[PDB]
Design a protein that fits this description.
The complex is a heterotetramer, with two copies of chain A and two copies of chain B (382 residues). Chain A is mostly beta strands and 131 residues long. Helix content of chain A is 6%, strand content 40%. Chain A contains one helix and eight strands; from the N terminus they run αββββββββ. In chain A, 35% of the residues are buried. Chain B contains 13 helices and eleven strands. Chain B is globular, with a radius of gyration of 19 Å. The chains are: A mainly beta (131), B alpha/beta (382). The structure holds chloride ion (7 copies), sodium ion (2 copies) and zinc ion (2 copies). The site of one sodium ion (NA) has 7 residues of chain C, from loops. Chain C: Homodimer. Interacts with the ChsH1/ChsH2 hydratase via the DUF35 C-terminal region of ChsH2 (ChsH2-DUF35). Chain C: InterPro entries: Thiolase, Thiolase-like, Thiolase_C_2, Thiolase_N. Chain C: Keywords: Bile acid catabolism, Lipid degradation, Lipid metabolism, Lyase, Steroid metabolism.
Chain lengths: 131, 382, 382, 127
């Protein structure tokens, strides 16, 4: 699969290909925004840059997909809503943990998934290894 | 003046099935003609048509097939089933301003039997599909899990919604699950789709069409049925609204855009929650019924589970709910068939009529920009 | 809920109009929307309604979360491409007149020049066209134009005079693509055939860009920076046996009955006659349908638009100054929305080609489709 | 392959058999084209077809010059034909130079093979 990339989100997937997880930021008022877009809703500036995330966060919510089967994944699989330390949130996969062991608020850290030779994606794993 | 200016005078539907055997346009035309006839009108009387952005039977194709002919009003509302009550707001607005006299709102599709550009709508999927977050059930599940965390609701609390839906559907001959009620045990035994949602938390897709005729309240008084006056009609989209995935707000366990709908409905109609005698609460998935009750003021934040467990959604309770069986039990016509049930409740003609009902609150799709109505008995004797 | 005169356009905003914007459709929308809000002396958080076309890819929620508009109480679409332009403003005025919304932005933004290019009724309509190679808008219009020539004796030079006056006005408009680039009628006749009876210079080019318009109550507009452009008429129209660009099956196909229907409402709403119109912005993505528009709107007799135009009435010094920005043909093809902006300028006094004081301006939307129009005028008083 | 669905498939199936048909309401017998599931005159969803005589007149026409169409030699003609039965139909017009076409001229039906899986009605001068 190729993500639905256009001019307003290409920067984030390009950073991901370089194994940098980034957050869009207004260059004028420095307010972060995610999901991204061309304008700052706080001050109206169209000038923006990015900050690199620390790579830390917490499970804010999650889902455990059981049925129907997804082709690209072993079932069941987990998608988490991760609240990054910087204060924005991010949907991504949560790997390395049995679904019944997930706790809301648990600390997680960034890892990188090569979804295919063309696509590298950020994913999160528990800060505490599951053995 | 909008509130009370217009009324629903006609409802019309095809059979709801899993295989219509005919085109979406034919279903739209059947439902539209049925609603027109139900209002005691003729197709040439119609001068307005409203549907959803995604509906493939355009206003002009409906009009030239049915003999509606010329139109002075034709509009769409987006965001899927979020739009259902908005189509009626559109019609009421056109009537109140004199743009149109007779407006038909419709939706018809073969969602059970039927078979990306550079824009922002397409690009929104980049945050979802690469991670396998690809279905509406999963999008809803992300909210439901957090609501459980914050308020201690359980799967059985969501299941009670399914049970009452199916209880009402079981006595509704038009419902897909006519004569097939479920138990809470049935709900809990049904397979996981995406935690915390079981199979029986999720509605199935449908083939069918639904139409509604809106006229001035004065006109409706000369038509065959008790008018279902449009006392409130509202749209709502919240701060940092996304399509099913507003996961980035300070709190994600409510539905702020439904709170905004409700505030307008009560202000428009001059009513309070205590004045509402029944509710048609959009229920393509069960869990968001709970925050809907809270957003609309029927119980305190986090206490919908208690409101439901106490029996208030039952026919004999304080807030008889989804007396047709809901999207979950009757049919998934993206909320439009729920507006029709609200009309029956006002008329007194529901298959599960909970006695006399003066005011009925109807909601549209949850997780999206949405809408609502308050339909009421005619307030004559002023 | 009186509609005529209840609402006004207080702000207009646009990106540059180009052949390659170098940025996204959403960015263009956001730029035009914020420009229009600032033009009205307002802030994004003041906005509570958004209206666009069905095909616009920058949905209301994406514009709102990028610009800081935040919550919305009103969000609707109008279909049929450029036929929708004036209908978006009707929507806004209706929401203002009924109290649904206080501040509505109508917008359209796209990269139609530079952007890369089911079983429902809309898709199926193409079955009557594509197998025979009738696959372009120029060809759909040409079929009407040839019959208009046959019935009324109009010639290619009559259509050319529209292109000439369009380009004369665009030539003094710095925002127009063809600024400083007028044409002669000889240029028009020498330009290559596209589809007889249309030459290349009968056809507009595609554009990249965004256009937005801010609509508020007339009372509110009186406190904002510019002379209010009151919405004295706002109407939609779809005719008997209406098709999408190809209504070839009516008894007569040389008029535009749906535009006559728009005009009837505009005049009735506004209390005006054709003689009261100080200027006309007539949709002109192709030149030939300007002629039947003049007839449908009552400025001249059936079949005599060629004579009305030959007499010089469309010039800046004529009795019906027309397309003073250059039109879709000369300025930019923003599916009619930039024409509404020029009409606002004419009421304000700020057109680059201002013909003097202009009290009332009639604007039309796309031709060949379900369509719309406006009458904008000066404040009749306080 | 055209944009075929349940409401217009009959017409292309008939064209496959070299029959030009017009949809008709089974109840009030009123013809309609383009087709659709419902009769706008009486509301019936019952319909059948009648076969056209094969004659008509040029009601309007276009001559396409530019840009090039892949499936056609440029220029080509598309005509709006008024059938004797009273409905109209868009088709191609062949067997006459574009500068010789006159509005109102009589035409007769012929059949175009176009790909080995699609047969289409075409019109040419009566003569
Ligand atoms: Cl994607
Ligand atoms: Cl289980
Ligand atoms: Cl806020
Ligand atoms: Cl109770
Ligand atoms: Cl067009
Ligand atoms: Cl030439
Ligand atoms: Cl050919
Ligand atoms: Na009509
Ligand atoms: Na707002
Ligand atoms: Zn900023
Ligand atoms: Zn009939």
């Amino acid at each position: 699969m190729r993500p639905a990339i256009n001019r307003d989100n290409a920067f984030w997937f390009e950073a991901a290909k370089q194994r940098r997880l980034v957050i869009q930021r207004c260059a004028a008022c420095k307010t972060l925004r995610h999901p991204p877009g061309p304008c700052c809703p706080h001050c109206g500036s169209f000038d923006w840059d990015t900050v690199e995330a620390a790579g830390t966060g917490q499970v804010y919510s999650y889902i455990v997909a059981h049925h129907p089967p997804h082709p690209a994944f072993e079932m069941p699989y987990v998608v988490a809503l991760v609240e990054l330390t910087e204060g924005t949130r991010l949907v991504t996969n949560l790997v390395g943990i049995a679904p019944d062991k997930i706790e809301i608020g648990m600390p997680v850290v960034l890892d990188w998934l090569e979804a295919d030779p063309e696509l590298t994606l950020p994913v999160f794993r528990p800060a505490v290894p599951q053995e | 003046v909008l509130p009370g200016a217009a009324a629903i005078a006609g409802i019309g539907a095809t059979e709801f099935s899993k295989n219509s055997g005919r085109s979406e346009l034919q279903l739209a035309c059947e439902a539209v003609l049925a609603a027109i006839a139900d209002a005691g009108l003729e197709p040439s009387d119609v001068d307005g048509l409203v549907t959803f952005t995604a509906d493939t039977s355009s206003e002009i194709h409906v009009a030239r097939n049915t003999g509606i002919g010329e139109l002075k009003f034709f509009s769409r509302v987006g965001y899927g089933g979020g739009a259902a009550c908005g189509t009626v707001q559109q019609a009421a607005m056109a009537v109140a301003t004199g743009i149109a006299e007779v407006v038909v709102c419709y939706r018809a599709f073969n969602e059970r039997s039927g078979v990306m550009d550079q824009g922002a709508d397409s690009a929104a999927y980049a945050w979802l599909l690469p991670f396998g977050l690809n279905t509406p059930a999963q999008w809803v599940a992300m909210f439901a899990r957090r609501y459980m965390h914050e308020y201690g609701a359980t799967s059985e609390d969501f299941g009670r919604v399914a049970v009452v839906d199916r209880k009402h559907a079981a006595t509704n001959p038009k419902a897909w699950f006519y004569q097939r009620p479920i138990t809470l045990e049935d709900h809990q035994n049904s397979r996981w789709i995406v935690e915390p949602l079981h199979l029986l938390d999720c509605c199935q897709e449908s083939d069918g069409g639904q139409a509604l005729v809106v006229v001035s309240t004065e006109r409706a008084r000369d038509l065959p049925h008790p008018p279902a006056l449009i006392w409130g009609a509202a749209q709502g989209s919240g701060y940092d609204q996304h399509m099913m995935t507003s996961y980035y707000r300070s709190e994600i366990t409510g539905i702020p855009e439904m709170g905004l709908v409700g505030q307008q409905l009560y202000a428009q109609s001059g009513l309070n929650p205590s004045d509402i005698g029944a509710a048609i609460l959009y229920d393509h998935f069960t869990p968001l019924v709970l925050p809907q009750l809270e957003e609309l003021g029927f119980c305190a934040r986090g206490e919908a589970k208690d409101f439901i467990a106490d029996g208030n959604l039952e026919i004999g309770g304080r807030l008889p709910c989804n007396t047709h069986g809901g999207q979950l039990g009757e049919a998934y016509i993206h909320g439009m068939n729920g507006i029709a049930e609200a009309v029956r409740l006002v008329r007194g003609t529901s298959v599960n009529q909970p006695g006399d009902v003066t005011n009925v609150l109807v909601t549209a799709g949850t997780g999206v920009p949405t809408s609502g109505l308050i339909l009421g008995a005619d307030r004559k004797l002023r």
